[PDB]
Amino acid sequence: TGYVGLKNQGATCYMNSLLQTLFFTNQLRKAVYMMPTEGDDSSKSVPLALQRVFYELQHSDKPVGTKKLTKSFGWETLDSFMQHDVQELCRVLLDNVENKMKGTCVEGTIPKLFRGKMVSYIQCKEVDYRSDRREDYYDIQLSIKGKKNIFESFVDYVAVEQLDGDNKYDAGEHGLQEAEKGVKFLTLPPVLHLQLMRFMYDPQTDQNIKINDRFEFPEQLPLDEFLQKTDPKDPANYILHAVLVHSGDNHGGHYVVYLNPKGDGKWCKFDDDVVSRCTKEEAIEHNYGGCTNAYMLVYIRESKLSEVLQAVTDHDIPQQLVERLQEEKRIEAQK
Numbered sequence: 001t002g003y004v005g006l007k008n009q010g011a012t013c014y015m016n017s018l019l020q021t022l023f024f025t026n027q028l029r030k031a032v033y034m035m036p037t038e039g040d041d042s043s044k045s046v047p048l049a050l051q052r053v054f055y056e057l058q059h060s061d062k063p064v065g066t067k068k069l070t071k072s073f074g075w076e077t078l079d080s081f082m083q084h085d086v087q088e089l090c091r092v093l094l095d096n097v098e099n100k101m102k103g104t105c106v107e108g109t110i111p112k113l114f115r116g117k118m119v120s121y122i123q124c125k126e127v128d129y130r131s132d133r134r135e136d137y138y139d140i141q142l143s144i145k146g147k148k149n150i151f152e153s154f155v156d157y158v159a160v161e162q163l164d165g166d167n168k169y170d171a172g173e174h175g176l177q178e179a180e181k182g183v184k185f186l187t188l189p190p191v192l193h194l195q196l197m198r199f200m201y202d203p204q205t206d207q208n209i210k211i212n213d214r215f216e217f218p219e220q221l222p223l224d225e226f227l228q229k230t231d232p233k234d235p236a237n238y239i240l241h242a243v244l245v246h247s248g249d250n251h252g253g254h255y256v257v258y259l260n261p262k263g264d265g266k267w268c269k270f271d272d273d274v275v276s277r278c279t280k281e282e283a284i285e286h287n288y289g290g291c292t293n294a295y296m297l298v299y300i301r302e303s304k305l306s307e308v309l310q311a312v313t314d315h316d317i318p319q320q321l322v323e324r325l326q327e328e329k330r331i332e333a334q335k
């Protein structure tokens, strides 16, 4: 393959799976290396630690380690990774890096890549009163129960809820009323983070548990029909890039990720230290379920494919950074 793996070294769960995903968002990687971490303290800077990981993924022949990363954002209780979502890990990592980038030439890279926008409304039937709230989003949480596929999940997301007797809306001055409540998308970002909601509250044991039901997702995903307005020059057509996968339960469980890093439909399986070529069927259909299946999808917008996935060379890494890491790697010859 010529791609390199991440070491296990503990109970970091989905951590390795996320990290490869971000690394092969090439546009992000380049802007990460541009951060001015020249002054930052080795041990406690998250920005520096991410730089180090990306460097090693890019240069090393040998499986790559992450203790200094884990240490830097400080998840070291017995239940740290067990009690958190993937998207919480994502938000910790990308929010540290966004802040470090302000006042530089690469400020605003994170929002450019990940942030879209959305409108939640309540509208009264008989009386003139409406409430619109506008929100930004970096990811989307999709419902899987009772749903054949991504199209069904989207239809459900933009569904008009109905407010009737006993469930009427309190419209303030106007008192209780009958209303429609809904959600629309105004924009979908270049890189689309979708979590499938597979960890759900069990009323029978007062806990949350994993649904292994069937759920289909396509290689190519048109979403124009879920937009309030379309643009014929940039249709919302997306390409699949990453499939984050899990098998088992709390007794025994394993995290892996499938990528086609160049966007060309040539897939590889990343399993900690071992990376290997695989088929398209192994990345996509063998992860539908219906036990090894998908909990997170990454899609990239067709018109943005080449920019997001632009090539990287060793010249894209500044000298000052390289020299700092050559120093650490010299001290790391203690056998």
Ligand SMILES: O=C([C@@H]1CCN(CCc2ccccc2)C[C@H]1c1ccccc1)N1CCC(O)(Cn2cnc3ccccc3c2=O)CC1
Residues within 6 Å of the ligand: 013, 014, 081, 082, 083, 084, 085, 086, 087, 141, 195, 196, 197, 198, 199, 200, 207, 208, 209, 210, 246, 249, 250, 295
């Ligand atoms: O790794 C995990 C879970 C950690 C905990 N694990 C079992 C440990 C346990 C111990 C003692 C009692 C019980 C359980 C379940 C693991 C899981 C794997 C596969 C599927 C769902 C869960 N992850 C990452 C992916 C995850 O973030 C996706 N996601 C994201 N957003 C949502 C939003 C709304 C509803 C569900 C989800 C959701 O599942 C879940 C947490």
